[PDB]
Amino acid sequence: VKVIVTDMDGTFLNDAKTYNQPRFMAQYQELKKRGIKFVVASGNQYYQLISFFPELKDEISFVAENGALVYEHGKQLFHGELTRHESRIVIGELLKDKQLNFVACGLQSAYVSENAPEAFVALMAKHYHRLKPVKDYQEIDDVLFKFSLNLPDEQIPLVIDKLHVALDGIMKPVTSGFGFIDLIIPGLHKANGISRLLKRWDLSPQNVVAIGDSGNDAEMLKMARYSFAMGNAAENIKQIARYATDDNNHEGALNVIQAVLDNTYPFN
Numbered sequence: 001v002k003v004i005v006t007d008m009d010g011t012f013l014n015d016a017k018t019y020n021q022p023r024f025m026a027q028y029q030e031l032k033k034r035g036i037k038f039v040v041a042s043g044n045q046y047y048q049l050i051s052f053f054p055e056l057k058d059e060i061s062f063v064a065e066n067g068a069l070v071y072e073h074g075k076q077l078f079h080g081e082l083t084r085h086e087s088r089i090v091i092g093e094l095l096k097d098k099q100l101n102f103v104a105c106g107l108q109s110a111y112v113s114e115n116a117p118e119a120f121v122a123l124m125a126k127h128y129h130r131l132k133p134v135k136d137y138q139e140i141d142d143v144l145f146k147f148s149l150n151l152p153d154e155q156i157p158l159v160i161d162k163l164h165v166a167l168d169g170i171m172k173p174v175t176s177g178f179g180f181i182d183l184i185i186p187g188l189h190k191a192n193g194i195s196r197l198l199k200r201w202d203l204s205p206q207n208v209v210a211i212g213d214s215g216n217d218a219e220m221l222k223m224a225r226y227s228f229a230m231g232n233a234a235e236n237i238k239q240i241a242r243y244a245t246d247d248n249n250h251e252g253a254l255n256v257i258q259a260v261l262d263n264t265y266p267f268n
């Protein structure tokens with residue numbers, strides 16, 4: 001094991017969105033001593049992710065925005081981008097749905113209509129700490145690489161086909177990690193983001209430990225040699241992952257880290 005990657009909502013975080021900082025801090029210092037890298041891979045905004053690791057932000061790596069933004073040692077390594085024409089097309093399509101509330105995710109900040117219901121904005125603010133109200137989605141001065149819709153992820157199945165023909169591969173729907181639908185650039189998933197870090201570190205999936213719970217973790221868990229599904233993980237995720245651990249309210253992710261440190265099952 002040379003890399004441990006975890007994803008946040010429903011994994012590293014309990015339902016109250018907190019984690020055991022003292023225990024994790026002690027574990028991290030040991031991982032550092034052993035030269036093992038730590039990576040946070042989540043659909044959440046980069047700026048929201050670092051709020052969870054104030055003391056370690058420049059030491060650990062991040063695969064944010066479900067894979068569209070990657071940071072290593074406090075420095076941006078890569079970011080995806082929709083062409084201006086692509087973003088116009090996607091936004092135009094979303095605007096055709098009158099009951100939809102959504103957020104446009106960019107490099108410098110995320111954006112939401114100044115007229116979107118407060119309840120929706122309040123929920124999104126929990127995942128995008130840099131969230132700016134705009135008067136129009138089409139005049140945004142930023143590079144956009146993701147969208148977050150107020151549609152339940154349970155509806156993905158009814159949504160892929162509609163989106164496939166309306167957007168045609170410009171973007172694909174996947175779970176946001178917190179119950180709703182993210183529209184991402186095809187190929188810019190967590191595994192792809194993790195590969196950029198591995199390539200830079202000259203390591204392989206062979207040395208990777210990944211922990212997840214939902215659909216946006218599929219390629220990450222399929223890629224890692226030591227794949228773990230949280231006890232609360234969705235069925236298809238428990239099927240994809242080779243190993244299991246306790247649920248997110250019982251420090252399931254920290255227990256995987258402990259298994260690495262003490263070399264217990266599955267590490268031998």
Ligand SMILES: [Mg+2]
Pocket residue numbers: 007008009010011177212213214
């Ligand atoms: Mg999750």
